[PDB]
Each structure stands twice: as structure tokens, then as C-alpha cells.
């Protein structure tokens, strides 16, 4: 069966040997002959949100994505810095506003949401963002929506995770319920995990410092873990 | 958060170094301090369905499960033999009837289904089994149902997989739709994969020759991949 879309889901690169780890992955993905429609990086791109790390990340990943004709989708994590990411990864004016955006890949909507809280490790979504999200989802996409964020809306199975988990998941749940969100892509946990959130499948990719393949069929979304 | 139930999801042990691989896993799980309510093995237990392999499997796994007070849940795979498994793993009279069974873990229903076809590698579910399954699911379990089987009802992302995939998934889908089946546990693929089937989350554990942790919360089921 041919999927409608193929995505690559990578997370938690933590660049500041993370350079070798990511380099080795990209080289391995290049040799596979995989041709993704988009490559989605679900946060913690730079370990300390360093300008130099973003420059290195961009230098490694942009030629890889260009070779494949794949859209690059960057997401904020708790380790990242909004202003330095905008500047050195995106070529956008520095700002501390949430990195929220919408990207249509043919008929497939990818929504990037920013769960990060500046100077903190836990996750939160502000009122402005929920409203923005609700308004966007009021119009259905032809092939539905993939929501990409950092902190997963799933129960913490480790005590260590609870202190840095996504807070106020109920409010997000109220926005997402009944929408065309078909899957939520996340990171943060540094091990491969899946669950549902208000009936929506959530898939967490492990850290790079493997990744996931995402096959979007007409009726289901398949997430495969690539070590 | 405390889950309602903890399950261990292991698959594709292929015993006939698979002995060392499984031994090393069980020892590792024992050191973790994990106390599962059940341990579910989703098929391909013996590589050639050998009596000796089932004896070895039983010898390795029964003391492990006994130490933890965990229920053992065995599932048929394409590599297994129904008669030899019944005899040497279960202490049951030899039979080639499908290995279908129901196990209540407090309020949680685990249904074991047999997708294997004797002498063949692909998956099928017979009419007798669908009827049996439909009748069982007509009564809801207090905490819903986990369906455990070998061949996953998810699209084959590899060409090699298509020839040995589960056939006639539509019929199974018709039975499961609207039931209290909250999750489907599967194997067969030999890599970690998740998707939905008729709105129901399906989680495939990789092979042993790691495994998954399953945390059942009141409102969601979390699957975590343990390398
Ligand atoms: Fe991280
Ligand atoms: Fe197998
Ligand atoms: Mn994080
Ligand atoms: Mn198999």
C-alpha cells in the first residue's frame, strides 16, 4: 500500500557527541532511499539554546532536506531559546513569542505548537495559543492535521518526568476534541512512547543524542521506530 | 500518577542466541523492580514450534512470572504449533483449534486471539473466531479490553511484510468497532510500530531474538518501548 504522506519524526538532538549522533542518523536515512514529504524535529534542538548550535544544526539538516525536496518543520523544546532559534535557524527577527505556525503539505495540515516556557523545563500552553489553535482547527484540512509539539499530553510513567511534564492538559484537550487532528507528534521523554489523548494518537520519538517514520494512510497513521 | 494496571508486552522470542537474549531481558526486568499484573507474549514463541523450545520457554518464564505474582498470557504466532504449544507450554490436550481465550485481570479483560494459519506465515481469522469474539465483546468489562494477537491489523510499510500480513482485516474491524477494546497488542513485525485500527490503538512490540511496558490509566493506555 502507498501512503498519502511520509514524514520523518526526529527529536531531542541537544546540539551544543550529538553532532556525530545526528550526522550518523542523516547519513543512514540518506542511504535508505526514503523520500519524506516533511522532516519534523519535535524540540530540544539545542541543549543550551546556543546560536552556534543552531548554526550547526541548520548546516547539517538543510542540505539533507533540500536533497530530498522535503519540508523542514522545526519545533521549540524546553532546552531551546525562542529568540536565538528564530535568528539562527529560521532567519526571522528575534522574538520571545511562542513558536506557533501552520504548514500545509498538499492537503495535510501540520500545526507546530510551542509548549516551552522560557527559562523553565516544564510545559505550558498559554490562553493566546489555545485561541489561535481553536480558530485554526475550525476549518478542516483535506487530509486532516498532524499536531507537532514538544511536551506530550500523556501521563508521566516516571517520577522524574512529572516535574517537567506538560501542565493543564485539560484545556488543550477541550480544544482538540472533535477536530481533524489525526496524530500528535512529541518528544521530551527521550524514549519511544505512544498513547492517546482525548482519543487522538500521540507518538513520542526517542532522542538522537534513533527516530520515527510516519506513514499517513487515508484511514490511519502508522508510526515506526527506527533505531 | 498510578496506573490501574501494568502489563509487560514481549514478542517474537523465536526459541529453538534467543535463549541468552530472552534470559538477559528477564534478568534486566527483574532488576528494575517492575511488578506487572500480566506478562503478554504476542506470538512466535518457538521458531519452529518445537516441543523442546516450549519446554525451555516455560522453564525460563514461569519462575519469572511466579516471583512477580503476574499472570502469564501466551499468544500463537505463525512460527508456533498449536498442538505442541498446548501440550508443552499449557499442559492442555493437543489440538489444532485456534488458541482463543479470555482472561480477566481484576476488571481488565484480556482477549487472546489466534491469527496464525497452520503451515503458513500469513494471518487470518476464521468465521468461528469472529463470532466467538463478537459474543464475548457483547458484555463490557469494568476496565475495558486489551486484545492480544500476533499479526497486527495495520498497513504493511514494507513490501516483504505484505505477503505475510493479516488478511481480511475488514471483518475484524466490523466486530471491534464500538466495543470496549481499548488497545490491541501485536508482534510479527520485529520492529516497534503503532497505529490505529477502526479508531483503536494498536501497538507492536519489537522482537526479543527489547519489549514494551503497558500502563493502563483510567482514560488512556500508554505503551513504552524498553530497549
Ligand atoms: Fe530533551
Ligand atoms: Fe516472528
Ligand atoms: Mn524536553
Ligand atoms: Mn510472525
DSSP secondary structure, B130-166, as one string:
HHHHHHHHTS--TT-EEEE-SS-SS--SSHHHHTTSB
Q: What is the Å distance from ligand 2's center to B9 Cα?
A: 14
Going from the N-terminus, what domains does chain A have, and what CATH number goes with each?
Answer: 1-227 (3.60.21.10)
Technique used by the depositors: X-ray
Distance CA B83, CA B92 (A): 9
- CA-CA-CA-CA dihedral for A67, B158, B213, A209, to nearest 10: -20
Nearest to B22, CA basis, from B10, B35, B32: B10
* Experimental resolution (Å): 1.9
Report yes or no: B83 at the A interface, CB cutoff 8 Å. no
Task: Tell me whether residues B215 and A1 touch, CB distance under 8 A.
Answer: no
Rounded distance between C-alpha atoms, residue B197 and residue A35, angstroms: 25
- Between the alpha carbon of residue A219 and those of residues A173, B164, B195, the distances in Å are 22, 21, 10
Three-class DSSP category at B83: helix
Report which DSSP code applies to B97.
Answer: S
CB atoms within 10 A of CB B150: 30
For chain A, the DSSP string reads ---SEEEEEE----B--HHHHHHHHHHHHHHHT---SEEEE-S--BSS--HHHHHHHHHHHHHHHHHHTPEEEE---TTS-HHHHHHHTT------S---EEEEETTEEEEE---B-TT-SSB---HHHHHHHHHHHTS--TT-EEEE-SS-SS--SSHHHHTTSBP-HHHHHHHHTTSSEEEEEE-SSSS-EEEEETTEEEEE------EEEEEE-SS-EEEEEE-
Sign of CA dihedral A179, A182, A187, A192: positive
| Separation between Cα atoms, residue A143 and residue A217, nearest integer Å | 9
Alpha carbons within 13 A on the beta-carbon side of A210: 14
Residues in B touching A215 (Cβ below 8 Å): 155, 157
- In Å, how far is B221's CA from the nearest CA of chain A? 6
Query: Rounded to whole angstroms, how far apart are CA atoms B125 and A122?
Result: 46
DSSP per position, B48-71: S--HHHHHHHHHHHHHHHHHHTPE
Grid coordinates representing A211? 527516530
Of all helices (H) and strands (E), which one includes residue B173?
A: helix B169-176
C-beta atoms of A220 and B203 within 8 A: no
Sign of the torsion formed by the C-alpha atoms of B48, B50, B56 and B57: positive
Helical pair A169-176 and A127-137, crossing angle rounded to 10 deg: 20
Q: Which one of the ligands is nearest to A166 CA?
A: 3
d(CA B181, CA B200): 7
Q: How far is the CA of B103 from the centre of ligand 1 (A)?
A: 39
Set of chain B residues whose Cβ sits within 8 Å of the Cβ of A197: 220
- Residues contacting A205, CB < 8 A, separation 6+: A9, A10, A11, A12, A42, A185, A186, A187, A192, A211, A212, A225
Strand ordering across the sheet containing A71-74: A71-74, A38-41, A5-10, A211-216, A221-226, B193-197, B200-204, B181-186, B145-148, B108-112, B101-105
**Cα B108 to ligand 1 centre (Å):** 34
Min Cα–Cα distance to chain A from B9, Å:
13
Contacts of A222 in chain B (CB under 8 A): 154-155, 157, 193-195
**C-alpha B165 – ligand 4 centre gap (Å):** 9
Owner of C-alpha cell 539562527? A88
Closest residue by Cα to residue B216 from B149, B142, B152: B142
Amino acid at each position: 500500500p502507498r501512503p498519502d504522506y511520509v514524514l520523518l519524526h526526529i527529536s531531542d538532538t541537544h546540539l551544543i557527541d550529538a553532532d556525530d549522533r545526528l550526522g550518523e542518523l542523516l547519513e543512514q536515512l540518506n542511504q535508505s532511499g526514503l523520500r519524506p514529504d516533511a522532516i519534523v524535529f519535535t524540540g530540544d534542538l539545542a541543549d543550551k539554546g546556543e546560536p552556534a548550535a543552531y548554526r550547526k544544526l541548520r548546516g547539517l539538516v538543510e542540505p539533507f532536506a533540500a536533497q530530498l525536496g522535503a519540508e523542514l518543520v522545526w519545533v521549540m523544546g524546553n532546552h531551546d531559546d525562542r529568540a536565538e532559534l528564530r535568528k539562527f535557524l529560521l532567519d526571522e527577527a528575534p522574538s520571545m513569542a511562542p513558536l506557533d505556525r501552520v504548514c500545509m503539505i498538499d492537503g495535510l495540515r501540520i500545526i507546530v505548537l510551542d509548549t516551552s516556557v522560557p527559562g523553565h523545563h516544564h510545559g505550558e500552553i498559554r490562553a493566546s495559543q489555545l485561541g489561535w489553535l481553536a480558530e485554526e482547527l475550525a476549518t478542516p484540512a483535506p487530509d486532516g492535521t498532524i499536531l507537532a509539539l514538544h511536551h506530550p499530553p500523556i501521563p508521566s510513567v516516571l517520577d522524574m518526568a512529572v516535574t517537567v511534564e506538560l501542565r493543564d492538559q485539560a484545556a488543550l484537550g477541550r480544544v482538540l476534541r472533535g477536530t481533524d487532528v489525526r496524530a500528535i507528534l512529541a518528544g521530551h521523554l527521550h524514549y519511544s512512547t505512544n498513547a492517546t489523548f482525548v482519543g487522538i494518537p500521540v507518538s513520542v520519538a526517542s532522542a538522537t543524542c534513533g527516530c520515527n517514520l510516519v506513514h499517513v494512510y487515508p484511514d490511519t497513521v502508522v508510526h515506526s521506530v527506527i533505531p
